[PDB]
Amino acid sequence: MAGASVKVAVRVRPFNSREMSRDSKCIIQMSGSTTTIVNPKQPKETPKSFSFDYSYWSHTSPEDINYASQKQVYRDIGEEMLQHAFEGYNVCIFAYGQTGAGKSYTMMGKQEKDQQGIIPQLCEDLFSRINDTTNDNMSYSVEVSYMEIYCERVRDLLNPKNKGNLRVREHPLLGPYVEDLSKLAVTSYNDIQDLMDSGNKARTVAATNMNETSSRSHAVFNIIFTQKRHDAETNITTEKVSKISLVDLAGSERADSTGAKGTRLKEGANINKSLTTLGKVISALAEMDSGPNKNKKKKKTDFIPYRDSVLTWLLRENLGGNSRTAMVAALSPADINYDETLSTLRYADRAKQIRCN
Amino acid sequence: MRECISIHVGQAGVQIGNACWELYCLEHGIQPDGQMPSDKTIGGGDDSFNTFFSETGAGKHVPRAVFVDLEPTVIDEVRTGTYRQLFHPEQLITGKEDAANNYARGHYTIGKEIIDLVLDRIRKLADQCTGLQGFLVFHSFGGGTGSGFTSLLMERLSVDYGKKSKLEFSIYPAPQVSTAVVEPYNSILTTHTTLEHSDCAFMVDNEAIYDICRRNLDIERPTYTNLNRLISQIVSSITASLRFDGALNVDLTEFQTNLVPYPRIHFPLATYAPVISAEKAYHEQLSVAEITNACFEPANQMVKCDPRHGKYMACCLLYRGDVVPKDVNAAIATIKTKRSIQFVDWCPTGFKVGINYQPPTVVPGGDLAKVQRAVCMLSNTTAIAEAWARLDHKFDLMYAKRAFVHWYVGEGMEEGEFSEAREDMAALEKDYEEVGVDSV
Amino acid sequence: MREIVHIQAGQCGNQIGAKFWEVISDEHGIDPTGSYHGDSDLQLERINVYYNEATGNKYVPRAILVDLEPGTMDSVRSGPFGQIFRPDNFVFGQSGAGNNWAKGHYTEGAELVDSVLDVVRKESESCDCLQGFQLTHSLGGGTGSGMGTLLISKIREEYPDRIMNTFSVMPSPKVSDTVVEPYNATLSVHQLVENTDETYCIDNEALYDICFRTLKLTTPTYGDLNHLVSATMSGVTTCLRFPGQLNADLRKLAVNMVPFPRLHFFMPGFAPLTSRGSQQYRALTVPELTQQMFDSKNMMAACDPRHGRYLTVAAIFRGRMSMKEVDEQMLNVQNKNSSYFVEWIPNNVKTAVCDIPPRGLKMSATFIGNSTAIQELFKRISEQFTAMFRRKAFLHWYTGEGMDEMEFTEAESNMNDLVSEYQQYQDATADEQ
Ligand SMILES: CC(=O)O[C@H]1C(=O)[C@@]2(C)[C@H]([C@H](OC(=O)c3ccccc3)[C@]3(O)C[C@H](OC(=O)[C@H](O)[C@@H](NC(=O)c4ccccc4)c4ccccc4)C(C)=C1C3(C)C)[C@]1(OC(C)=O)CO[C@@H]1C[C@@H]2O
Ligand SMILES: Nc1nc2c(ncn2[C@@H]2O[C@H](COP(=O)(O)OP(=O)(O)OP(=O)(O)O)[C@@H](O)[C@H]2O)c(=O)[nH]1
Ligand SMILES: Nc1nc2c(ncn2[C@@H]2O[C@H](COP(=O)(O)OP(=O)(O)O)[C@@H](O)[C@H]2O)c(=O)[nH]1
Ligand SMILES: Nc1ncnc2c1ncn2[C@@H]1O[C@H](COP(=O)(O)OP(=O)(O)O)[C@@H](O)[C@H]1O
Ligand SMILES: [Mg+2]
């Protein structure tokens, strides 16, 4: 019941080659923590302004003044969150955005390893600290699992068997968990990248009018970190157990965007339902963290809709109690995608909306 | 010719259309089975008015109407009712479930697969038309199929028929009386369609008509039949200028030119003065001045709003029957002197006047008395903002906790779109508050 | 056509289904041999909602019957309306569940579920536009719990977007018939919460109280309780079969009544009920039906609504009546009893009207409530469950069928969570920090 503060971050990518060749226009402005969007259809009306915790102008690659470099993004989010994980408390990071926007850049980064995402940098720092602090008494263990949620059904990506629906159980002491989920040990961030690539190969994708291989399912990479202290005592026990989750949320979907009936509509409805449930649970968490942190009066137990989706249910231990949360939202800068970006901004308005101005 | 197409969406639209076509058939002497003995008896005239009916070689008259609804249960009453032979068999039923008070269902997961057929039928009707002037879309806020399918249909019609007028005769939720829990969500989501694609949206309230029936007509237990008949009378009074002769006729373009100052404030109230029972038809002069004054009484308005809490900016009076312009001018002069009826300083002209010789018709088995004179008022006023504000409050009370939201987003709706609609609606209120301010 | 597939499992479910089909056949004027001898044309306007048509101008109900004990089937066949049903739909085994949820779910029911689902698939494929299902069972813990929940899960997996309605009889504190009611009730409520859209709570204690106090019956039997449940079942779906001034489809009720996905447990009710002694002293009007519907003693769930708050309410009237009176009465009920209604919903009384009343009444009404008081029922079961699970009173009968102990805990946790949900909106204020 310690609470879990949530940080809301938005980032803008540069123009792609096709948009750069075409005479496209930027529609996004940023000032401190305020982000404003201007409609291209009627530019003369007004720009809608929103407030978030962090606003990242990664628009111009050679820019010198106020450029949100990937290392800067790490230093705001991933470094603090890894440090929180080291203390023995749970951690979860979320990624949201439409296809053609960032997401992959934010989480993974470029393949040349000159500019990296949150995942590889966090893994490198974790393992470097492990090698630094591992004395004769310490013992650090790392395990990894990677699963997907698709129509509120859990599937394993690492294990190549017939892709049946795994069963979700509730250990009375350890909370929710998944039965018969592959768990593997790892010894370097290279192993993490290999397992993540193999899992991403097996994810469920489909063809729509927005993209040829749009994501149709959520995916989570749980990093289980275990610390054992062989102190000068007659009883040596595992001192702490903490988990780090990296969540890849599929973007929202509208009916007119995908006119196909049957499977595609059901997938879109399920994704939308899971997204609104996640918005509700994160917003309730943000409010409950904000309140006690200043008042220090525990109002009964409040409430939070854990059992409204499999995603929120399985992340119950990470989402709340004693943990930290943070979500990064990616935005396109081109006018052509305006409406889509606005939808993303609206989903970023949740999680303790800041009013200001 | 002068020709208008009527479209009925949802149960409210279908029943209002039943009442309207009863009234029209009674007016023009057309039997329920489509024949007219009057032409055979006389051998002349033009009683097969093209404003609502199309003639075939056999003397049968087909109405210019399209009925649409996803429930088969309300249209099958018409297809097996008294007027089963009047309408063309293309009644356009979707053999599936209803939108179920869900805007998303009526809009873009089940409203499709029938919109194409509806647009094809509308195109077929319009191709037979030579001088098509506008559309009369009947629907109802709050319901699912009404709001959603009206949004889709008006969007498509504006794409295809962007020049022609599109009038709405819709029912607005009442302050306290309502028959649904998720009604404010649908009503707020209807704002985009009733703003961008509608040219003049008339709104009525069930509570106001119930009060009118209780007080004026002394009907203590009215049903939807009386409400539909009153709305039919108002629509007939509006449309009478295109059918019968008169000293001063008012076309649809004249309505749109005179009533709306600016494009975004095309939301006028409507009212009907001589609503009186047969017993109370006696003991009353019912002169032009009396009915003209009765129009302005706040108790007779069909939307639960107070005109005294606002300023009139455009009034249009349509007189029917034995009415002479001298009495109308005297009534306008009398009205302009009263201080309770406040007009905007930037519309010194004030009133539009139209007179038509054809008196009203009494529907057999009805409740309105036979009256030589009648009048219908249309009035653009700021008080309508009040009728919006209360509903706006209701929306907040359900959107703060995201109640019932999962049903809508389960059918291809983005949550943020709700807020978008709210934002647009808020602008409307401010716009009204901008126009009532005195000039400087 | 909006067409429904009806299923019934267990003794309670099968008997309620038999009485319900008797009531529906009387409403549509169906001869017990299957022929039609009705009075009006509206009876066959929407006969496809519940019946299929045979080549001999006979109407076979779209019903499927399930029971692991064959005896329950025989009493249905040797009855007033035994011959009406299709013989191929009498799916049954030859080994009773013995009031063991594990036997009905894992061991015995797992073999008959394939045949039952094959019959359900055959019936559904013949339906030109399927709307939803309608399962009648009980939480006593025999076939109705195990096979009921298993069929619910299987049908939900096969047909995800269709409506799933269930009429379920809950245990009671003061009237009991089996020793292991709490275990089976909790395990069934888990699956009911997971995989249903509407669940109408029914209590034997409430029905007995209605019979004793309202109907003034001296020796009530199971037939009268079945009759009341049948009246409620017909009133719920009346709007699908007849025209009216304001229709209410099943999906309309599901959308208007369920604010959040897990809160879909409903308290039914029916009016009028006059006892046949004071019938001539009672004036039948919409205000009288409104007064009787909201009365605490008329509820069928044995939960006092005055101990909580109404999340939503629905009233389906049948008969010729003016809608101004109906709306005024609903508004007056909301205003006069404002303390018992949730305040963050501006209006929480869905209304529907139909022009065709029951056969022998001028007008009637069906009530569906959704209030926090229902939590009390669950709480009672939970208490009893603890009293047996702390010591493992009868667990060895379940674990012998391959059921793990942990599952019990899971169910209990889910049950408790549901109670907390219904407790969230119960308090009539939120100011204090
Ligand atoms: C006033 C009048 O005309 O006579 C009534 C009557 O006196 C009362 C007492 C009836 C009577 O009901 C009972 O005695 C009864 C006892 C236990 C459980 C249920 C009913 C009646 O038997 C019940 C019977 O009801 C019907 O016919 C309805 O259609 C009803 N049942 C059946 O149609 C039916 C069909 C086949 C076999 C058995 C019953 C119904 C209600 C809702 C939906 C569908 C059907 C009628 C007219 C009466 C009597 C005969 C005394 C009542 O019946 C109901 C539930 O509607 C109980 O109080 C109500 C209304 C009346 O006051
Ligand atoms: N004045 C008047 N109002 C009506 C009438 N019929 C329905 N309404 C109103 O219309 C609202 C719902 O309209 P509809 O969209 O047609 O409802 P529906 O036919 O069941 O279709 P769905 O809303 O999609 O389920 C109700 O809340 C009523 O208040 C009528 O005959 N007269
Ligand atoms: N209302 C009603 N309840 C019944 C009837 N018969 C049995 N019950 C209830 O059903 C419970 C017994 O469960 P049962 O149906 O026999 O188990 P199963 O048939 O093997 O699945 C008891 O608590 C009874 O109250 C009936 O005819 N009407
Ligand atoms: N500094 C930056 N911040 C965010 N995005 C960037 C940056 N630099 C380049 N990008 C672009 O981000 C895109 C992310 O790739 P893509 O696979 O489209 O992501 P998604 O998985 O969202 O489709 C790349 O195409 C890349 O060009
Ligand atoms: Mg409808």
Numbering used by the authors:
A (entry chain K): 1 to 357
B (entry chain A): 1 to 440
C (entry chain B): 1 to 433
What does the publication say?
KIF1A, a key member of the kinesin-3 family, is recognized for its high processivity and fast MT plus-end-directed motility. These attributes are crucial for the long-distance transport of cargoes in neurons. Mutations in the microtubule-associated motor protein KIF1A lead to severe neurological conditions known as KIF1A-associated neurological disorders (KAND). Here, we present 2.7-3.5 Å resolution structures of dimeric microtubule-bound KIF1A, including the pathogenic P305L mutant, across various nucleotide states.
In conditions with ADP or without nucleotides (Apo state), only classes with single MT-bound heads were detected, lacking a visible connection to their partner head domains. This configuration represents a state where one head is MT-bound while the tethered partner head is unbound and mobile. Extra densities near the MT-bound motor in both Apo and ADP states hint that the unbound head partially explores the space behind the bound motor domain, as also suggested by the backward orientation of the linker’s initial segment in these structures. The structure of the MT-bound motor domain was similar in both conditions except for the presence or absence of ADP in the nucleotide-binding pocket. In the one-head-bound configuration of KIF1A observed in the presence of ADP and in the Apo state, the neck linker is undocked and extends backward towards the MT minus-end. Beyond the fourth neck-linker residue (N357), cryo-EM densities become notably weaker, indicating increased mobility in this region. Notably, in the KIF1A ADP dataset, about 36% of the signal near the tubulin was unassigned, compared to a maximum of 5% in the other datasets. This significant portion of weak signal could represent weakly bound mobile motors, consistent with the expected lower MT affinity in the ADP state. The open conformation we observed in high-resolution KIF1A-MT complexes, both in ADP and Apo states and in the leading head with bound AMP-PNP, represents, to the best of our knowledge, a novel conformation for the KIF1A motor domain. Our comparison between the crystal structures and the high-resolution KIF1A-MT complexes shows that MT binding directly induces the nucleotide-binding pocket’s transition from a semi-closed to an open conformation, providing a structural explanation for the enhanced ADP release associated with kinesin-MT binding.
